[PDB]
């Protein structure tokens, strides 16, 4: 690495940092011998110098060269840790997978101090020891002669281009808060540190100020420079640098197959389901609840197209969250997606009057590569939402889940079988089967949903046996967009094995609605408990985070 | 893939595109047998249908199901080529390396029509057949029954988010220009095509409108939708899609080891060098001349911190191009860089008064991953430029090149040897060797250049034997920044094996300057011809593009 000058012209001196291999410049000034003092190891391949331990005084060790020349050596220990192996308290670049390395940050997007409405990352202060549990700890470890820093100084810095993405605090009292001051942040990218001589350890707390986005890959690098200050009228020179690389934890969404934790909310049926599912039911608009995870802590985060002690909030934003959903974990042509894929609806090709999810949302979700996006066709609906025809439920067998699609074909087959058995007068079935306009409107919808069937089984790695066809009819409005004919039986509330399904008011045979019996015959064989809720159509459900750690995936 | 409905309720019909495997929905309506007509192949694993050739009439082939049900089939050929194998005229996603696939675009940044000062990609017209040689050709190949398009239509489109990055023209008369109209561009992302029945081939010309940047990864996708138009009062449905993916060719720089082509320009010495090097010498500020390459054409491009028929211009922008240079091809810890690495100077850590190359230039150069960037320390200079201490020249042996550094140590050793032989009065050498202030200024510079020696040999995969130490002294100015003591002998003009070196006016022994003899003894053994130019310090040199194709690299 670093080159050391050796010459007969006069004695020289250099500083070596433990773990760094340096080179000696002997052949530039005068076949020679190297005589190294105890604790100094020199190899020839081209002369490489290394030292076993830090010195207690300036010029503690020396190397003599005989062809004569003399070099003095001072050894120091300078290193920065920052949780590189991903386990916490561990005491090169960032890589992916179970065999990789690199530090992780959380965005400090919760509100631990209840005396203010502001977000914890918006100010320049740590007001409580609880906020430190949301920050990544790194230790600066040093060992030098007691007088070493009279001719040397250490500077900690972050690249100017990312100084508004990270803030670094001084850990006065270590694990405890004591109104910590700022070392780095949006007001300056670098600062000197008054490091004393001897063996010392200083703690820093590092927090992320933003989520990954189009202009932010997610990596933040903190570097420490050792400068030579020995001549007070001469500019300072760099003699050693060391650094650690962090990645900002991405926002991860939970699908319907993750066990539920709590429900925010008709209420008699929701309470009954919350009790059978062993969930916490409490008292806002529709929002998507996800999380961010680091080796030291997991934090819930709300995504808004509201903050609590460990309840995070992120924005980064005309189609609402009924158009944004997530699959269960899948394998696609040999590639694994341990956290599933993110599904959103749009148009099959752009036009002068079509709709799509705003590009800022597509860029935000795509910028966080742990859950790959999928484009589905939804612009054929009056509202344009995926949840109108597509939903997921758990299953105990091979796949672990089922994909549920709306099927006009399943409803027409059910009505024709009732007509064949002499029930055409039930409310009527004969008036629905004879309506040519309704059949033609559903024929358009059948091709639309079947196009999505192909996109879903191609992108999610599914078989036809993994898909259930739930009877559901559609009609076109005065603007030619699809709307439900009767209450939507696919857009259900899922709490583990208990399903809160909107109640249909279709034809009834022997005391039971034909649509409810058909739905039960498709879902109850999987162990799923079906209840039909009167007038089903501000409800949000938080699910358990994945057991899989997102940094072990290889996108 | 696409699902086809089969039922005893009534006969059905579907369209199959050659090369696509479709599925038959038989078990949803009624153990059965499949009777397929000639040219129709059906496999069971789960029933997969495929067809051998396109039909000449609607309902040409049929499949009978006996448990009875009947399905009619029409076969069509619909495909889009676009040079997927990278050879030209070939007739999934984009991948890197010699075993990959995907189409390539050039940015139409030259000026082929000399009647206007505008750039060819700025307007919506192709004014000359020569401009078509700078555009990527793709053929749309179709074969349908003569009456097929009375119930079907084809739409070509580009994703809305990238519609301002690509323009697609109609190839009236094929290889020739005939004032071609626009199919796609910044004014609309999609358009229908009037495709007739029978066997036809339509040509398109696709051009890129921008270079890769922070908000542009370089990929552009063009998709063709087949729509079912059979019911004029019912919305159109998608039944088939196909697409091709293009990458925009990045800007590539040429190092000093590429053979020269022409020189833009004291002139008596430049003409002498241009003649010995067999180069074209002709009659602007300093600019960096590179190129963009695609399988069908190579185009020179000028990068500005001016346009000709095949002479491109790109901007995307306080440190000028003396601070931006390129290494020869290298191997770094087992990773190959066939096109070298891009070197630029900045500060060792940011401060409240330091300098760096503007972030827009770092983002533009980093956005084009074919030549990886390297950060060097140059803020210690009065001007902050890399070219002040670092340059490259060819070499015939092991490495193929040499890395040249300024060395105050080489100049002081040369002067001390002359002093030891009794030449201290030459102009004086004794007055330079006795000047303690000059020695202390150079000691600071020695550590600065040695820091860069470590960065260069670590990032470029070099040995100490690959580096030559050229005698050069420095002094600090009234603002503490480094300036040359005597004319800079590292910042030379390289034309193959002939070097245009600024002339020093240092001590002379036996009719020759000591600095010139030392430089000759270091460079002439490599076959390099050295000439020393009086008053050396608007010159630009264009080099031959690399023989290696950038799309065969794996960044």
């Amino acid at each position, epitope marked *: 690495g670093t080159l050391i000058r050796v010459t007969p012209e006069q004695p020289t001196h250099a500083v070596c940092v433990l773990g760094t291999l340096t080179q000696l410049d002997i052949c530039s000034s005068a076949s020679f011998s190297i005589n190294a003092s105890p604790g100094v190891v020199v190899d020839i391949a081209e002369v490489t110098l290394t030292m076993k331990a830090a010195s207690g005084s300036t010029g503690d060790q020396k190397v003599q060269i005989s062809y004569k020349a003399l070099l003095y050596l001072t050894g120091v220990e300078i290193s920065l840790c920052a949780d590189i192996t991903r386990t916490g308290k561990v005491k090169r670049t960032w890589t992916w997978g179970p065999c990789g390395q690199g530090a992780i940050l959380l965005v400090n997007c919760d509100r631990d101090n209840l005396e203010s409405s502001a977000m914890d990352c918006e100010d320049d202060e740590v007001l409580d020891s609880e906020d430190l549990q949301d920050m990544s700890l790194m230790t600066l470890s040093t060992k030098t002669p007691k007088d070493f820093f009279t001719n*040397h*100084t250490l500077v900690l810095h972050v690249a100017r281009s990312e100084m508004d993405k990270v803030r670094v605090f001084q850990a006065t009292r270590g694990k405890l808060s004591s109104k910590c001051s700022v070392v780095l942040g949006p007001k300056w990218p670098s600062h000197y540190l*008054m490091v*004393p001589g001897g063996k010392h350890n200083m703690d820093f707390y590092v927090e992320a100020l933003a989520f990954p986005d189009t202009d932010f890959p997610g990596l933040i690098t903190l570097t420490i420079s050792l400068l030579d200050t020995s001549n007070l009228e001469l500019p300072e020179a760099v003699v050693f640098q060391d650094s650690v690389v962090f990645r900002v934890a991405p926002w991860i969404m939970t699908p319907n197959t993750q066990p539920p934790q709590e429900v925010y909310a008709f209420l008699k049926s929701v309470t009954t389901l919350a009790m059978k599912a062993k969930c916490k039911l409490t008292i806002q608009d529709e929002m998507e609840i996800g999380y961010i995870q680091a080796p030291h802590k997991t934090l819930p985060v709300v995504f808004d197209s509201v903050m609590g002690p460990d309840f995070g909030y992120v924005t980064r934003g005309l189609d609402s969250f009924g158009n944004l959903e997530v699959s269960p974990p899948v394998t696609v042509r040999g590639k694994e997606y341990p956290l599933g894929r993110i599904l959103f609806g749009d148009s099959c090709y752009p036009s002068n009057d079509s709709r799509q999810m705003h590009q800022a949302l597509q860029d935000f979700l795509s910028a966080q590569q742990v859950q790959a996006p999928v484009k589905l066709y939804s612009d054929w609906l009056s509202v344009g939402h995926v949840d109108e025809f597509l939903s997921f439920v758990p299953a105990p067998d091979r796949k672990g889940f089922r994909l549920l699609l709306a099927s006009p074909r399943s409803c027409y087959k059910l009505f024709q079988e009732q007509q064949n058995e002499g029930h055409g007068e039930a409310l009527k079935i004969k008036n629905i089967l004879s309506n040519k306009t309704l059949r033609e409107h559903n024929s358009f919808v059948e091709r639309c949903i079947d196009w999505n069937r192909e996109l879903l089984k191609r992108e999610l790695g599914l078989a036809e046996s993994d898909i259930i066809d739930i009877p559901q009819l559609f009609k076109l409005k005065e603007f030619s967009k699809a709307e439900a004919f009767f209450p939507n039986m696919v857009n259900m509330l899922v709490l583990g094995k208990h399903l809160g399904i909107p109640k249909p008011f279709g034809p009834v045979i022997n005391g039971r609605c034909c649509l409810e019996e058909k739905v039960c015959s498709l879902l109850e064989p999987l162990g799923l408990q079906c209840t039909f809720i009167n007038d089903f159509f501000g409800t949000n459900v938080r699910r358990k985070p994945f057991s899989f750690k997102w940094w072990n995936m290889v996108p | 893939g696409t699902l086809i409905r089969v039922t005893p309720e009534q006969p059905t019909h579907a369209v199959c595109v050659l090369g696509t495997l479709t599925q038959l929905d038989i078990c949803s309506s009624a153990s059965f047998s499949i009777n397929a007509s000639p040219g129709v192949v059906v496999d069971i694993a789960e029933v997969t249908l495929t067809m051998k050739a396109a039909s000449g009439s609607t309902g040409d082939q049929k499949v009978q199901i006996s448990y009875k049900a009947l399905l009619y089939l029409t076969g069509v050929e619909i495909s889009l080529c676009a040079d997927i194998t990278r050879t030209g005229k070939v007739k999934r996603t984009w991948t890197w390396g010699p075993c990959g696939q995907g189409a390539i675009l050039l940015v139409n940044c030259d000026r082929d029509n000399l009647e206007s000062s505008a750039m060819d990609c700025e307007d919506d017209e192709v004014l000359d057949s020569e401009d078509l040689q700078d555009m990527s050709l793709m053929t749309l190949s179709t074969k349908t029954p003569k009456d097929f398009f009375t119930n079907h239509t084809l739409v070509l489109h580009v994703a809305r988010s990238e519609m301002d990055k690509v323009r697609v023209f109609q190839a009236t008369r094929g290889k020739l220009s005939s004032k071609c109209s626009v199919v796609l561009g910044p004014k609309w992302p999609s358009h229908y095509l009037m495709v007739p029945g029978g066997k036809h081939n339509m040509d398109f010309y696709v051009e890129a409108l921008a270079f890769p940047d922070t908000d542009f990864p370089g990929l552009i996708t063009l998709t063709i939708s087949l729509l079912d138009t059979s019911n004029l009062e019912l919305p159109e449905a998608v039944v088939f899609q196909d697409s091709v993916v293009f990458r925009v060719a990045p800007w590539i720089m040429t190092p000093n080891t590429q053979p020269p082509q022409e020189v833009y320009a004291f002139l008596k010495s430049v003409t002498t060098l241009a003649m010995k090097a067999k180069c074209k010498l002709t009659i602007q500020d300093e600019m960096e001349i590179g190129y963009i390459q695609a399988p069908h054409k190579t185009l020179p491009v000028v990068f500005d911190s001016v346009m000709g028929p095949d002479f491109g211009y790109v901007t995307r922008g306080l440190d000028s191009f003396g601070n931006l240079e390129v290494s020869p091809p290298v191997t770094v810890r087992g990773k190959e860089y066939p096109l070298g690495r891009i070197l630029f100077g900045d500060s060792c850590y940011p401060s409240n008064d330091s300098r760096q190359m503007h972030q827009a230039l770092q983002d533009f150069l980093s956005a084009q991953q074919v030549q990886a960037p390297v950060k060097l320390y140059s803020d210690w200079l009065s001007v902050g430029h890399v070219d002040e201490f670092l340059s490259f020249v060819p070499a015939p042996d092991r490495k193929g090149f040499r890395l040249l550094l300024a060395s105050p140590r080489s100049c002081y050793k040369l002067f001390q040897e002359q002093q030891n032989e009794g030449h201290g009065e030459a102009l004086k050498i004794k007055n330079i060797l006795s000047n303690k202030t000059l020695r202390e200024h150079n000691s600071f510079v020695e550590r600065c250049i040695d820091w860069n020696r470590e960065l260069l040999k670590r990032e470029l995969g070099l040995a100490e034997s690959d580096i030559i130490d050229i005698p050069q002294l420095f002094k600090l100015k009234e603002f503490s920044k480094a300036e040359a003591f005597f004319p800079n002998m590292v910042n030379m003009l390289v034309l193959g094996k002939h070097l245009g070196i600024p002339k020093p006016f240092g001590p002379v022994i036996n009719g020759r300057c000591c600095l010139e003899e030392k430089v000759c003894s270091l460079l002439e053994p490599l076959g390099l011809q050295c000439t020393f130019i009086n008053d050396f310090f608007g010159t630009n040199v264009r080099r031959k593009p690399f023989s290696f194709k950038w799309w065969n690299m794996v960044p």
Partner: antibody
Amino acid sequence: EVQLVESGGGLVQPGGSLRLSCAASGFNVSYYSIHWVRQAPGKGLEWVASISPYYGSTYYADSVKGRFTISADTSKNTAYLQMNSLRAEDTAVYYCARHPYRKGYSGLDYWGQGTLVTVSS
Amino acid sequence: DIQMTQSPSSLSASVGDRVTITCRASQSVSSAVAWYQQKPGKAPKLLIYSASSLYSGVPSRFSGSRSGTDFTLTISSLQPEDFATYYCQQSSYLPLFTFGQGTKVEIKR
């Protein structure tokens, strides 16, 4: 030789503002950290604020956070301290001192003579 | 925000005696301390710039020490010019300093 000369003192009203300055001679302020220290009549030393013009950082004591602002001009070799919303408790002599952090120690070597700021109706 | 207490608040001795002034920090500061002397009407003068080590130009009568979080200044062979108010300064990483209450040394009679 090194010298620090404070100015900008005097008498002000409660709720008002006042700016102090300190001109440096013998060194360039861009290479040193500059501190202000307050001493009320009959009391000890209180640290007020610091600036490091080379890095651009500033720090303040809890007793003045949100009221006091510290700055420096490297072309005039002069440091400044801007006071706002002064109260009777802010009456004291304000000293300007140099911190040569490049020498490895935390102590303040050169101090000025001090300027009295009085807050009273 | 590490707090400190300086004591005794008043000391007395005759010329030629040996006196000590101490201060306790609530938490360790890794030897980041300094000592100052002040006379009425004058700015504070630096004696010690780090634990123990003496500032250039100060008489050899002054020396410092540390034991855990307790820091001490020893003044040997006390001279008439040494009768002044002394302050303990606590420092750390970054330029943020905290001063003690201060102690006065007077003349015994």
